Amino acid sequence: MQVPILEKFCFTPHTEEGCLSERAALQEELQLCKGLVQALQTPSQQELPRLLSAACRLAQVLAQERPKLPEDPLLSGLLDSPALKACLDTAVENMPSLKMKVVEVLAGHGHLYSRIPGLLSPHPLLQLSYTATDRHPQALEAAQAELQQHDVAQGQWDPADPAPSALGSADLLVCNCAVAALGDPASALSNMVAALREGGFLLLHTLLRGHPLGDIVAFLTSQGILSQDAWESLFSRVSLRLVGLKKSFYGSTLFLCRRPTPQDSPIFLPVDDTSFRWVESLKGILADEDSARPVWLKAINCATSGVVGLVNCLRREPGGNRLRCVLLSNLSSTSHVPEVDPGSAELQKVLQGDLVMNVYRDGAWGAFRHFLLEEDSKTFCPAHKSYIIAGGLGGFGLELAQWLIQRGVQKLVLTSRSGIRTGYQAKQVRRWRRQGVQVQVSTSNISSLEGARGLIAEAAQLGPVGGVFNLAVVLRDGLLENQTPEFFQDVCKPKYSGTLNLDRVTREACPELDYFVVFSSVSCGRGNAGQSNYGFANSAMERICEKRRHEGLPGLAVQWGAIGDVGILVETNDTIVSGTLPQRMASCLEVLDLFLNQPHMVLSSFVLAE
Numbered sequence: 092m093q094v095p096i097l098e099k100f101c102f103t104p105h106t107e108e109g110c111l112s113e114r115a116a117l118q119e120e121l122q123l124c125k126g127l128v129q130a131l132q133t134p135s136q137q138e139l140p141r142l143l144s145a146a147c148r149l150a151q152v153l154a155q156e157r158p159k160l161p162e163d164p165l166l167s168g169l170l171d172s173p174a175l176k177a178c179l180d181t182a183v184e185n186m187p188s189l190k191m192k193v194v195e196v197l198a199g200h201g202h203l204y205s206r207i208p209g210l211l212s213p214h215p216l217l218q219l220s221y222t223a224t225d226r227h228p229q230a231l232e233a234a235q236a237e238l239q240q241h242d243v244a245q246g247q248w249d250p251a252d253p254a255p256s257a258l259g260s261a262d263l264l265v266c267n268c269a270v271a272a273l274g275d276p277a278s279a280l281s282n283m284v285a286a287l288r289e290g291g292f293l294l295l296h297t298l299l300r301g302h303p304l305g306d307i308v309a310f311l312t313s314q315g316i317l318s319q320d321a322w323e324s325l326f327s328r329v330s331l332r333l334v335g336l337k338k339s340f341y342g343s344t345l346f347l348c349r350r351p352t353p354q355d356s357p358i359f360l361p362v363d364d365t366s367f368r369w370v371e372s373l374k375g376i377l378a379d380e381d382s383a384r385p386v387w388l389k390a391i392n393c394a395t396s397g398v399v400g401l402v403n404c405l406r407r408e409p410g411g412n413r414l415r416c417v418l419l420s421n422l423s424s425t426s427h428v429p430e431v432d433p434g435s436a437e438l439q440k441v442l443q444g445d446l447v448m449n450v451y452r453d454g455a456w457g458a459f460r461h462f463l464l465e466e467d468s469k470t471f472c473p474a475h476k477s478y479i480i481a482g483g484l485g486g487f488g489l490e491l492a493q494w495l496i497q498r499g500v501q502k503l504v505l506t507s508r509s510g511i512r513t514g515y516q517a518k519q520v521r522r523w524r525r526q527g528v529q530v531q532v533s534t535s536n537i538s539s540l541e542g543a544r545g546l547i548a549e550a551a552q553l554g555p556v557g558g559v560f561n562l563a564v565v566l567r568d569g570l571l572e573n574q575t576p577e578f579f580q581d582v583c584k585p586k587y588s589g590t591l592n593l594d595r596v597t598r599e600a601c602p603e604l605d606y607f608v609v610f611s612s613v614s615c616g617r618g619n620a621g622q623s624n625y626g627f628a629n630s631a632m633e634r635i636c637e638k639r640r641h642e643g644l645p646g647l648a649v650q651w652g653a654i655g656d657v658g659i660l661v662e663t664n665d666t667i668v669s670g671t672l673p674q675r676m677a678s679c680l681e682v683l684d685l686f687l688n689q690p691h692m693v694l695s696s697f698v699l700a701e
């Protein structure tokens with residue numbers, strides 16, 4: 092049986108502080124290191140404590156143990172955390188193509204080769220070129236086995252000098268200089284910038300002076316350890332723009348920077364109009380093949396806008412590199428809504444970063460990011476309650492119905508606009524009824540408030556509504572050039588409107604609701620060419636679930652990859668799509684058990700082709 096990649100999808104601020112605070116081991120090791128340093132002036136077997144104690148016994152000691160030091164948990168803490176992935180994925184999302192050329196500076200003591208390829212490897216489409224470099228060839232000798240496994244190329248580069256020609260036009264430069272010394276930082280960073288293509292990223296990991304870890308190390312080692320202000324001043328000096336910042340509770344820091352690109356005048360298009368008239372406008376804008384002006388889609392008046400999933404899909408289409416977006420999405424009504432009109436200081440900052448995804452949520456700018464699901468028992472259902480599957484006669488719908496029945500559901504309402512149309516559907520319904528399950532086939536349409544209200548009423552007769560499942564879908568596939576507002580309306584009706592209506596009706600009339608679940612897609616989460624409308628519709632459903640959960644209502648969006656055995660896509664299982672395999676229904680149903688038992692608002696499941 093195949094093993095899916097299971098992730099949570101979370102709003103992630105660009106700037107995060109106090110990272111790794113939950114980790115007891117690091118908090119415990121820091122306290123110890125602080126005590127040892129205090130002793131010199133006046134877990135325990137980790138490299139930094141062992142080194143300090145040796146100092147307590149007393150350069151010869153320090154020099155000997157230096158290669159071992161970067162792998163100390165405190166020194167490597169941010170690196171073995173979701174902060175690293177967040178930064179990398181931001182870079183990836185802002186690449187003009189599926190290729191990313193990566194060069195590691197001072198790899199000998201940096202050790203990013205043992206993390207970055209492996210973190211990006213589960214990406215099904217990404218073409219990674221990774222070169223580990225250092226000043227001396229001897230520096231990378233002990234890592235050869237690791238480098239070989241990950242297909243990491245090698246290079247000679249002392250950052251005090253300009254980069255060799257081979258390493259230039261890089262998309263991403265990475266450096267862990269927590270232990271490794273850059274030498275003169277200004278000169279080092281200057282050469283690093285030159286090695287980047289315009290729009291390329293720099294990812295620096297380091298220790299901050301004026302914070303415990305950095306101060307502890309600086310003491311031990313008496314160029315050098317720098318303050319945060321010093322680093323940020325250096326970035327400005329070499330024309331780098333800081334677009335990401337992750338700081339641990341002990342003062343280790345990931346700086347994500349970007350080399351700017353000369354910017355043509357941006358085109359602003361509001362995508363809030365309910366009639367989808369902006370579609371026609373956007374088609375005209377993209378139709379200009381010659382134009383290199385970036386296209387900035389603005390969602391400002393609707394927190395449930397699907398612009399994010401829209402953008403993901405349009406980025407995969409011709410002229411997609413031009414696309415950017417801004418989304419204002421407060422979960423709290425009390426939160427301030429910033430002004431992002433063209434004159435504004437808030438908008439200027441965003442334009443300077445030039446990031447594809449700019450989402451404002453409750454006081455912070457950031458973007459939605461994927462993270463490996465930590466959680467990695469079978470659920471059961473209240474047998475007296477009624478359960479509703481919109482699109483319940485479909486491929487996934489019939490399997491979900493079976494699944495629910497297995498878990499005790501006796502009362503089901505399956506909605507479909509045109510009712511039973513296949514022999515398979517007819518047989519399953521009859522069989523379930525024979526088994527004693529109350530199964531109602533409804534034509535009530537959640538696309539309208541009236542239809543949503545009638546549907547709940549129909550379910551309420553069988554029993555109180557315990558669960559709603561939105562599997563309704565209508566597809567209007569095609570590149571944006573061949574799209575229309577009407578087609579956008581058709582695709583959004585079962586999903587955006589359906590979920591808005593279900594949200595409202597269940598709020599008003601379903602106080603015993605335990606489950607509110609929508610089936611999203613990787614088309615929204617990752618992007619699929621020719622499905623921008625579908626990307627939008629799904630994205631909007633996710634936004635709604637998030638708002639609900641903030642208010643303490645049930646809400647869950649599942650981003651499914653290709654589904655096997657049954658469904659639109661199969662209508663097969665061995666058919667590779669975008670480096671992924673269709674997930675066998677049996678695998679899907681096991682994942683659902685896990686997902687229903689989950690605190691997170693938006694989840695993701697897909698299967699990688701080996």
Ligand SMILES: NC(=O)C1=CN([C@@H]2O[C@H](COP(=O)(O)OP(=O)(O)OC[C@H]3O[C@@H](n4cnc5c(N)ncnc54)[C@H](OP(=O)(O)O)[C@@H]3O)[C@@H](O)[C@H]2O)C=CC1
Nearest residue numbers: 482485486487507508509562563564585651654658659660
């Ligand atoms: N199949 C796949 O590979 C994947 C599926 N998706 C998601 O999974 C879910 C189920 O997909 P799948 O089973 O493959 O699709 P199917 O086409 O097999 O079934 C979906 C059903 O939705 C019904 N429907 C459409 N609009 C409405 C409406 N307004 N009210 C009631 N019913 C409606 C349709 O029937 P009728 O026309 O009679 O109304 C249709 O039978 C969807 O939400 C989809 O986005 C996610 C990832 C990949």
Ligand SMILES: O=C(C1CC1)N1CC[C@@H](Cc2n[nH]c(=O)n2-c2ccc(-c3ccc4occc4c3)cc2)C1
Nearest residue numbers: 215612613614617619652653659660668669671697
């Ligand atoms: O929703 C539907 C059906 C109901 C309409 N789907 C069918 C397959 C998929 C959309 C699609 N069609 N063709 C095609 O190649 N895809 C696809 C696009 C992207 C990714 C994918 C997955 C994980 C990833 O992680 C990082 C990047 C990335 C990309 C997988 C598949 C959904």
